[PDB]
Amino acid sequence: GRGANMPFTIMEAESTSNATNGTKLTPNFKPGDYAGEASGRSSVYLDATGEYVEFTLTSPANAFVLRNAVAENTTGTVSIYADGVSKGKFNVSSKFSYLYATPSTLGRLGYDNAPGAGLTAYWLYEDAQLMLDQVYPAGTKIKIQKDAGDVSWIYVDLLETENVAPPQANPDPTKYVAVSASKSIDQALTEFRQDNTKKGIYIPAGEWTINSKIFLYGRATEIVGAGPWYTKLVAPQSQSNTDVGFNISAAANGSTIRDLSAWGNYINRVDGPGKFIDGNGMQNVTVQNIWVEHFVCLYWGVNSSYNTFKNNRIKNTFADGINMTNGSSYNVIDNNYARGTGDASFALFSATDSGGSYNVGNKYTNLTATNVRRAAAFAVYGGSDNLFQNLYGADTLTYPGITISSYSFGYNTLGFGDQDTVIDGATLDRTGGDFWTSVGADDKINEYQNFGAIWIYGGDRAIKNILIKNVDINNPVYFGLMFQSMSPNNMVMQNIRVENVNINNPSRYGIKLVVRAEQGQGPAYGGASFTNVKVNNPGISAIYGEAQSPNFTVTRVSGNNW
């Protein structure tokens, strides 16, 4: 009931509703582990010819996405059956998975694709997409099976199913110049610009190369596809880390991109390039119903305002999904789905290194973000008057479900401003995790620093006016809520409120006031108010750190069972 409303249905392979003659992993929360990195922290291991997982369709489907893990540096197949009749072969491959690092060098996570001595493999799961020539009814038994000739072994994590409409044709051949076998995207855009009666271009079903950053200028431009399953923009797969996509300047304010998919060719993170859409001051641009993969980001906006991001799918990128800096204001990020982003899936960063003030007035609504391969599902870094509402986040590999931080990351930065940053209506399932190193740390349980479902981090910038309300935190890895001040700046927390929050079976505490994260770090400064904040069945205590935090005040307004 919370998050994005998407046309596809996700079914976990390990659900005991599904018959299998293979191996269900028992869950853990461990990076670089096939259960830890899986959706729902488990998957079904198919290991020998004839092993299968049998799903039952709850909704008709003609298209299927298998999130899976196969061996490093292999491509192959796994079989799919409909009611016991074999119907195709998924094309599975570890070409975009397996990024290498070390427990002590987790800052390199996402950047290094080559195996080497002493390196652990992370980011183990990738996706295979398959469309079948039949719409199958609900109640169909869809069997994922390892036949002779299929890959040696495979971890089956989940299957999304979708009933995909037929491809939409050119809305009007007189108003949209058509990409074709003889006409490239670039050429169609030239003809559009040069003929004032055209509203833009139509990209039809098929696979179209994008080896370029396509700049949209001149006037508001409409870029329309036949559907994400049918219109595929394809970065050249023979190459790697090719910066392609769209750049939308202010000349093309009011432009539209919709109903297509873009398949990148990145195999590791690169900082600078790699965004599918570049927003430099763009305004009133609508990005709608696109499906992006294997880019660094879907979108990175710079001082772009009044834009709409609606119904998109962001899967398997190497850094953020959607992020915005430099006074990017009054944008609507509504009804988007993210899975397997390589950094925070949905974020707002008030960086001012390009002459912009606060990110203000933005709305991040009906969002779903799972399997965050690094950092948080939702991250808010400074800003003012920004709303995060009706969110579902789950299975972060390393970090909180929600990060609220005034840390500059080394840039010219504004902290939180005069109006509340609000987080209203969130469900976070199995969020938090392990990252960085915990040398000299208090409350030390392992090699790493441990992160609660929600992290309130005072950095080197002001941290104030934060309202967290109507949040359900189910089985966090460690804590529900975690308050932490960076030393030595010791920025004081004012006007933090937590209302109607349930923390269900946190393994350690429901509330952790960080006392010494690291050598050189001290307790948190400021305070926070608590109303109807319920901690149910903690592992150790309901709240940790109160007595050791003399510079932090806990205001128990009412309703608190701790």
Ligand X SMILES: OC[C@H]1O[C@H](O[C@@H]2[C@@H](O)[C@@H](O[C@@H]3[C@@H](O)[C@@H](O)O[C@H](CO)[C@H]3O)O[C@H](CO)[C@H]2O)[C@H](O)[C@@H](O)[C@@H]1O
Query: Which positions lie near ligand X, rule CB under 6 A?
Result: 107, 271-272, 296-297, 300, 319-320, 325, 343-344, 347, 349, 351, 353, 374-375, 379, 381, 399, 407, 409-411, 435-436, 449, 517-518
| 449 contact, one of ligand X, Ca ion, none, CB 5-8 Å limit per kind | ligand X
- Say if residue 240 carries a ligand binding annotation: no
Cβ 261 to ligand X, closest distance in Å? 21
Cβ 14 to ligand X, closest distance in Å? 28
Output 158 or 344, the one with its CB closest to Ca ion. 158
Helix (H, G, I), strand (E, B) or coil at 106: helix
Q: What is the dihedral of CA 330, 334, 340, 342, to 10 degrees?
A: 0
Helix (H, G, I), strand (E, B) or coil at 186: helix
Cβ 410 to ligand X, closest distance in Å? 5
The first and second tokens of residue 503, run together, are 């923390």
CA distance 121 to 116: 10
Output 42 or 406, the one with its CB closest to Ca ion. 42
Cβ 284 to ligand X, closest distance in Å? 22
Cβ 49 to ligand X, closest distance in Å? 41
Strand partners, 556: 530
| 38 contact, one of ligand X, Ca ion, none, CB 5-8 Å limit per kind | Ca ion
- Say if residue 14 carries a ligand binding annotation: yes
| 542 contact, one of Ca ion, ligand X, none, CB 5-8 Å limit per kind | none
- Say if residue 485 carries a ligand binding annotation: no
Task: Report the residue numbers after which the chain has a gap, meaning the C atom sits over 2.5 angstroms from the next written residue's N, or none.
Answer: none
Give contact residues for Ca ion (rule: CB under 5 A): 12, 38-40, 43, 157-158
Cβ 41 to Ca ion, closest distance in Å? 7
| 325 contact, one of Ca ion, ligand X, none, CB 5-8 Å limit per kind | ligand X
- One DSSP character per residue, 467-531 reads EEEEEEEES-SSEEEEEEE-TTT-PPEEEEEEEEEEEE--SSEEEEE-S-SSTT-----EEEEEE
**For residue 524, how many C-alpha atoms fall within 13 Å in the half-sphere facing its CB?**
28
CA distance 101 to 228: 33
| 319 contact, one of Ca ion, ligand X, none, CB 5-8 Å limit per kind | ligand X
- Say if residue 12 carries a ligand binding annotation: yes
Strand partners, 426: 391, 471
258-285: b (≥16 Cβ within 10 Å) or e: bbbbbbbbbbbbeeebbbbbbbebbbeb
| 351 contact, one of ligand X, Ca ion, none, CB 5-8 Å limit per kind | ligand X
Cβ 146 to ligand X, closest distance in Å? 35
Output 158 or 528, the one with its CB closest to Ca ion. 158
- One DSSP character per residue, 448-473 reads SEEE-SEEEEE-SS-EEEEEEEEEEE
Output 208 or 299, the one with its CB closest to ligand X. 299
Output 21 or 555, the one with its CB closest to Ca ion. 21
Strand partners, 555: 529
Strand partners, 202: 178, 224
Output 115 or 411, the one with its CB closest to ligand X. 411
- Binding-site residue set: 12, 14, 39, 42, 157
- Binding-site residue set for Ca(2+): 12, 14, 39, 42, 157
